[PDB]
Ligand binder design. Structure first.
Ligand SMILES: *[C@@]1(=O)C(=O)[N]C2=[C][C]=[C][C]=C21
Ligand SMILES: *[C@@]1(=O)C(=O)[N]C2=[C][C]=[C][C]=C21
Ligand SMILES: [Cl-]
Ligand SMILES: [Cl-]
Lengths: 187, 187
């Protein structure tokens, strides 16, 4: 049976950090749902790329649970995720069922806001470190991708391929990740 | 005065190869127009990400010329670009005025279709090499990014940041490219 991914898309999301994981996961045969935080309408990302979600978050939640919940970064996107009660509920449920949670760049600061994964080793964008580390509830890492059990984090647009391939490896295994990677022409 | 980029967006375009250059160029202060080949409606990219263009190609052409014309890859996207008379006209005009043309992955095969830049050194996705080299009208390179004068080409999703930063360097200079690069957390 195919693995399933929920990508939560908020206004101000970093479009590269949204598109790279969606695309790479789909290359891996993962069924990906791009879910709009605010509803079904197109979402204006951080650098003004407009993406049409597959579904509203409200509707995608009804088809859960998912093998991974993915939080893109972008400062304003992450703030919107952090302020959302629906996101809190989704992440709590995922944590409680021991499902994977993946967040990149400023995205991991939503884990802090929703009290998810405390005690984990995590990374973030360098500019988001102080926010993430407020209260010392996590241990900080400078690894490009950090995976501490079911909390998987990464640093920035330039680590998005590594982040995506780590999700693929977690869900579908090393060999599938290697096969998906080769045609991408990564360094 | 700000430089201006036309990104031509066709059904089946590789969404990573579309979004990374748009985003990176906007980070560099370039005014980017995402122009829909088929008109103003949302475009279904290769891995099913749906992007809403800023304008139709017909409308964006009226605001030309641009400092760079950018052709994303994706096999089906590149085929749509290759079959388009409007694209032919845009690229001929750009070549004739000695403006930059940038293409990635299968994207450069549209240069072949429209007889653009013959004699240039070029790269493509490895799987697109035979198509590009039909007739020996270019010289092939395995460099991740190749720039031969005003023809700038690159290989794949995994070279999209390098491709984008090379466009930035060409238009705005080395120092701006370096400043835009640093916060991306590239290897
Ligand atoms: C990233 O997308 C984020 O969340 N915060 C940030 C700062 C600089 C570059 C990229 C990002
Ligand atoms: C790329 O986007 C293209 O145009 N052709 C191709 C083949 C494999 C991976 C990426 C690409
Ligand atoms: Cl941001
Ligand atoms: Cl393709």
């Amino acid at each position: 049976a195919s693995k399933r991914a929920l990508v939560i898309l908020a206004k101000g999301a970093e479009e590269m950090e949204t598109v790279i994981p969606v695309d790479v996961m789909r290359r891996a045969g993962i069924k990906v749902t791009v879910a709009g935080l605010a509803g079904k309408d197109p979402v204006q990302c951080s650098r003004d790329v407009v993406i049409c979600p597959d579904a509203s978050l409200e509707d995608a939640k009804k088809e859960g649970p998912y093998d991974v919940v993915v939080l893109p970064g972008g400062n304003l996107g992450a703030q919107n995720l952090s302020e959302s009660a629906a996101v809190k509920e989704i992440l709590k449920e995922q944590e409680n069922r021991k499902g994977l949670i993946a967040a990149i760049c400023a995205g991991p600061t939503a884990l802090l806001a929703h009290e998810i994964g405390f005690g984990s080793k995590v990374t973030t964008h360098p500019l988001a470190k102080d926010k993430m580390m407020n209260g010392g509830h996590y241990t900080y890492s400078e690894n490009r991708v950090e995976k501490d059990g079911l909390i998987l984090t990464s640093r920035g647009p330039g680590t998005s391929f590594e982040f995506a391939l780590a999700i693929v490896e977690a869900l579908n295994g090393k060999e599938v990740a290697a096969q998906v990677k080769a045609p991408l022409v990564l360094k």
